[PDB]
Amino acid sequence: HMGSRSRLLAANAAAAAFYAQALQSDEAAPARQYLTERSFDAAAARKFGCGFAPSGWDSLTKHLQRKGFEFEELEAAGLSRQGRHGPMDRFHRRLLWPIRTSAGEVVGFGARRLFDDDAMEAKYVNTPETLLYKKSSVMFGIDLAKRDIAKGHQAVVVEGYTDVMAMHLAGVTTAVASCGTAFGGEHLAMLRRLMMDDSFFRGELIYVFDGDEAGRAAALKAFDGEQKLAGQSFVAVAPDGMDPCDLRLKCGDAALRDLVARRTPLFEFAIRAAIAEMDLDSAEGRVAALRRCVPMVGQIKDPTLRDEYARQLAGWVGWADV
Amino acid sequence: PHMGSRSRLLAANAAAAAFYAQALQSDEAAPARQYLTERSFDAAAARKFGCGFAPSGWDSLTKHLQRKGFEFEELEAAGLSRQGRHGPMDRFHRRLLWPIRTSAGEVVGFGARRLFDDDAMEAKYVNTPETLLYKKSSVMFGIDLAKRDIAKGHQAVVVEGYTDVMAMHLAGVTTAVASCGTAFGGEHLAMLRRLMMDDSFFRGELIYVFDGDEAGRAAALKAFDGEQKLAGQSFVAVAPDGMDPCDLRLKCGDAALRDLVARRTPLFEFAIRAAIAEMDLDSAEGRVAALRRCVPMVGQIKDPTLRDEYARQLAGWVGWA
Numbered sequence: 001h002m003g004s005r006s007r008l009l010a011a012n013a014a015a016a017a018f019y020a021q022a023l024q025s026d027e028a029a030p031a032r033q034y035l036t037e038r039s040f041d042a043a044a045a046r047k048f049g050c051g052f053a054p055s056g057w058d059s060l061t062k063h064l065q066r067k068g069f070e071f072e073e074l075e076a077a078g079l080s081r082q083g084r085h086g087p088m089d090r091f092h093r094r095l096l097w098p099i100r101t102s103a104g105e106v107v108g109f110g111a112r113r114l115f116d117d118d119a120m121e122a123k124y125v126n127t128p129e130t131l132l133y134k135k136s137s138v139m140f141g142i143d144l145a146k147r148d149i150a151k152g153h154q155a156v157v158v159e160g161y162t163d164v165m166a167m168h169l170a171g172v173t174t175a176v177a178s179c180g181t182a183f184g185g186e187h188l189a190m191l192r193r194l195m196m197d198d199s200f201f202r203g204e205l206i207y208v209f210d211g212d213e214a215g216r217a218a219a220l221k222a223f224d225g226e227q228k229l230a231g232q233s234f235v236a237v238a239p240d241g242m243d244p245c246d247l248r249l250k251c252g253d254a255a256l257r258d259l260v261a262r263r264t265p266l267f268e269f270a271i272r273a274a275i276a277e278m279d280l281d282s283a284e285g286r287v288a289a290l291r292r293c294v295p296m297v298g299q300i301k302d303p304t305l306r307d308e309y310a311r312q313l314a315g316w317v318g319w320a321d322v
Numbered sequence: 323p324h325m326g327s328r329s330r331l332l333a334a335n336a337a338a339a340a341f342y343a344q345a346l347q348s349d350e351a352a353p354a355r356q357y358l359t360e361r362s363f364d365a366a367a368a369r370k371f372g373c374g375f376a377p378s379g380w381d382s383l384t385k386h387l388q389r390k391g392f393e394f395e396e397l398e399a400a401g402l403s404r405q406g407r408h409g410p411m412d413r414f415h416r417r418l419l420w421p422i423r424t425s426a427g428e429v430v431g432f433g434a435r436r437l438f439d440d441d442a443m444e445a446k447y448v449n450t451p452e453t454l455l456y457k458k459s460s461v462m463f464g465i466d467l468a469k470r471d472i473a474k475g476h477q478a479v480v481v482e483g484y485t486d487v488m489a490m491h492l493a494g495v496t497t498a499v500a501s502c503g504t505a506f507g508g509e510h511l512a513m514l515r516r517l518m519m520d521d522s523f524f525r526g527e528l529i530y531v532f533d534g535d536e537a538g539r540a541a542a543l544k545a546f547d548g549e550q551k552l553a554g555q556s557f558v559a560v561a562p563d564g565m566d567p568c569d570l571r572l573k574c575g576d577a578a579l580r581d582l583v584a585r586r587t588p589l590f591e592f593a594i595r596a597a598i599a600e601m602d603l604d605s606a607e608g609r610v611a612a613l614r615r616c617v618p619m620v621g622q623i624k625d626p627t628l629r630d631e632y633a634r635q636l637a638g639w640v641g642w643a
């Protein structure tokens with residue numbers, strides 16, 4: 001029993017149920033307001049397991065001790081830590097999102113700062129590394145997304161918790177997000193696994209960025225490694241400045257669906273964005289543009305894909321019929 | 323042993339080269355001298371490269387070297403003489419000869435060009451066979467004269483023939499060498515690569531000079547093959563109107579040769595631009611098709627820096643695309 005995988009999972013399952021209840025308190029008002037301020041109702045907050053970590057020292061820690069969980073289990077679980085005068089909660093006075101496995105089991109939390117006088121000055125904090133929680137592979141929304149990424153052959157990677165919430169509310173039930181870190185190798189590996197039918201990788205990785213310089217970071221990165229999934233990787237960017245949560249507030253659910261559906265392939269986005277910052281109305285600027293994008297096509301390792309982009313370059317700078 | 327040893331064989335060749343050099347001043351050698359003077363190689367040139375003439379008859383050199391003390395076993399071993407039906411006879415006859423030497427200037431064999439209409443031997447050029455001293459796949463004409471400046475200058479100019487070597491050296495291109503009888507292969511290449519290092523860490527530029535263009539084509543096809551370390555330090559130069567360096571110098575003078583070598587092109591640029599030269603660049607769709615044939619070639623370049631540099635110039639070489 002003591003400190004097994006399933007015991008820690010029972011503790012986190014217990015913790016999330018408590019924090020859920022705590023969102024229905026008087027001091028948790030600013031957490032609820034944060035939610036309604038960006039159009040997430042009580043049905044939504046419940047669907048994503050949204051909770052509140054209350055003030056005080058050890059509200060959760062005592063709760064789980066009083067229902068049989070020893071403190072050593074809770075430390076390895078990541079829910080509690082050792083203070084000067086005994087045990088205390090890890091999370092205090094924050095809006096919490098439970099972070100789940102693909103099966104739906106809670107393995108940790110992401111926690112947003114609400115109050116200006118809270119000692120922890122970081123905007124987001126997470127559960128640290130545990131037997132359950134692994135920063136590099138864990139994804140918010142993956143529990144709600146799993147069935148629909150396999151059926152639709154599609155995963156949609158967004159930046160934050162409220163972006164997943166907004167996407168799923170607007171019918172983009174394939175949206176997921178890395179928690180407290182960059183989206184990386186083993187997040188890709190896990191989505192890749194879900195999108196196998198037989199031994200073939202089938203589907204699309206649609207990255208949704210916000211602020212076009214964050215999108216240009218991924219573009220200049222797109223030729224770097226072995227380019228494994230580059231051919232099936234796509235980009236969607238909101239009307240400049242905006243993110244999925246904001247785009248939904250202004251323009252509604254349908255604007256999000258259309259943002260995802262009108263995604264551009266990753267190489268095409270990289271090449272054309274580099275053509276965009278150039279003068280295409282003279283022979284000189286024509287020439288300069290090719291001088292910088294022919295090398296980009298040069299780096300595409302897949303010869304089918306390289307030829308496809310090489311074919312279209314002249315058309316894009318204006319030298320030929322598109 | 324005493325008889326048939328390496329230095330004995332070298333001494334035989336040196337004696338044979340002196341004999342043949344003297345025989346170039348004879349009456350019957352006029353057409354050999356006329357071969358040289360007809361392409362502007364003076365008496366100083368002929369003496370510089372050790373030019374000689376193999377005389378008429380059967381055993382003229384053999385008998386000369388037998389008076390000097392050499393056994394027939396040794397002259398057969400050195401590739402100077404062979405066993406005929408009524409006795410020992412010379413390998414070469416009635417031909418203009420160039421001694422082929424090691425990089426230290428020791429004669430290891432000869433290249434013999436046909437001079438007469440009624441020459442029993444039809445081949446335009448004949449060489450010493452494989453002996454203890456002469457290996458066709460590692461021997462090079464000019465290497466004794468070019469050794470120093472190939473090492474110091476980190477440059478070797480590979481030309482096809484003996485007169486091309488002579489023409490290059492007379493024009494001041496002192497890094498010119500050539501293979502003898504056969505094609506320039508791996509051992510010639512690895513030797514020149516080594517030499518240009520100057521007992522150090524230097525990359526040196528290898529410059530191929532081709533007569534026509536099928537050789538240029540052949541070099542172009544090979545450019546991307548395998549690991550491509552010394553393709554990136556290789557260069558190509560071609561003369562106008564399908565002339566060898568010798569004739570280039572005849573018509574257009576020494577300056578043409580010095581600037582043939584100066585205006586040489588990297589092997590990758592040569593290959594790429596040779597592919598572009600077969601395509602119609604006059605229309606916009608032809609520009610695009612040209613671009614489409616070239617990015618695969620550029621993509622074959624393994625070195626990421628070269629690939630990018632060639633990729634950057636592709637628009638210009640197609641006519642702006």
Ligand SMILES: [Sr+2]
Pocket residue numbers: 566569
């Ligand atoms: Sr000729």
